[PDB]
Amino acid sequence: MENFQKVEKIGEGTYGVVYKARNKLTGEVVALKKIRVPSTAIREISLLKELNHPNIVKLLDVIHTENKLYLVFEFLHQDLKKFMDASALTGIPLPLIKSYLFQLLQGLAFCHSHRVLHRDLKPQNLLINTEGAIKLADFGLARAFGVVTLWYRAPEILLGCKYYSTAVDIWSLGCIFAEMVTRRALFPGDSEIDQLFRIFRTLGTPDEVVWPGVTSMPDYKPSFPKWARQDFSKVVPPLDEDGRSLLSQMLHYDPNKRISAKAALAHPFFQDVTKPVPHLRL
Numbered sequence: 001m002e003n004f005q006k007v008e009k010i011g012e013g014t015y016g017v018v019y020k021a022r023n024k025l026t027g028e029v030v031a032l033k034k035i036r037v038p039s040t041a042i043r044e045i046s047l048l049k050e051l052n053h054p055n056i057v058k059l060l061d062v063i064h065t066e067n068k069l070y071l072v073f074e075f076l077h078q079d080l081k082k083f084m085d086a087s088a089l090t091g092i093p094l095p096l097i098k099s100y101l102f103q104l105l106q107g108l109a110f111c112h113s114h115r116v117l118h119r120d121l122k123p124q125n126l127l128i129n130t131e132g133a134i135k136l137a138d139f140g141l142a143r144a145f146g147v148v149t150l151w152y153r154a155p156e157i158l159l160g161c162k163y164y165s166t167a168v169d170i171w172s173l174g175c176i177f178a179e180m181v182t183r184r185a186l187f188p189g190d191s192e193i194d195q196l197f198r199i200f201r202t203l204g205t206p207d208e209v210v211w212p213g214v215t216s217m218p219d220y221k222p223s224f225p226k227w228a229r230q231d232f233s234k235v236v237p238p239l240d241e242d243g244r245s246l247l248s249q250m251l252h253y254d255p256n257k258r259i260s261a262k263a264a265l266a267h268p269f270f271q272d273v274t275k276p277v278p279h280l281r282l
């Protein structure tokens with residue numbers, strides 16, 4: 001703890017405050033996350049330290065001192081939320097959107113193959129650098145432990161399913177995909193019920209035909225209004241057919257029919273993917 005010099009505060013995450021800090025010893029700049037400890041969490045976190053991938057923010061060290069928990073992560077200078085705000089006037093170039101989505105799916109495919117889920121994907125958790133790379137941050141912390149944005153929450157979570165799967169991360173990514181394309185949140189709910197209804201009004205109220213078992217979900221109510229499904233060409237206008245085709249498979253109601261990160265990587269949308277370098281103003 002005293003081995004780190006705080007330079008600035010990067011924001012208060014869900015599991016604690018994040019700071020940009022300098023390691024007195026090394027001199028390296030890192031992201032210091034103060035949490036707030038059960039042994040279950042300690043072991044869980046320990047496993048994440050082994051999860052190494054170019055599109056995953058590396059967990060450098062875990063400091064459990066004086067019954068306090070500090071996580072040291074590699075540091076990246078900007079998150080996707082800030083990059084989108086800075087590009088609000090012209091939008092993010094399609095080649096760059098395609099590159100970012102491709103890398104994010106590689107990262108998720110790696111995590112999901114290790115049975116590790118993010119559970120809380122959102123623009124703020126996606127970090128970028130000057131080299132054109134993008135990385136997933138805060139991966140696996142939801143399980144290690146336990147106004148919040150509900151905008152990217154999968155339908156099965158909102159309906160009370162307590163044993164969610166890797167599919168919830170694909171749903172969140174799909175929502176982010178749509179947001180980069182249109183420059184506007186896809187389902188900006190301001191409460192759990194409002195979130196669910198915004199999804200229903202766009203994708204249509206789900207039934208047993210499209211989502212077997214949906215009516216047996218814990219929070220499902222027969223009294224839910226029935227809205228018709230809206231056409232995708234209206235939802236994410238500029239996106240070509242390859243893109244809309246991919247997006248639709250990422251947003252399937254039934255978690256079991258929703259596309260995996262692995263299968264999405266082979267989708268025709270990525271046939272012409274490249275790695276452009278973004279103009280970043282740090």
Ligand SMILES: O=C1Nc2ccccc2/C1=C/Nc1ccc(S(=O)(=O)Nc2nccs2)cc1
Pocket residue numbers: 008009010011013018031033057073074075076077078079082083127137138
């Ligand atoms: O670099 C980081 N590694 C992490 C691991 C887990 C959780 C968070 C992080 C993390 C955060 N970095 C970061 C750096 C800059 C910005 S920003 O430029 O978009 N906004 C701010 N800049 C200064 C203060 S707030 C946002 C996130």
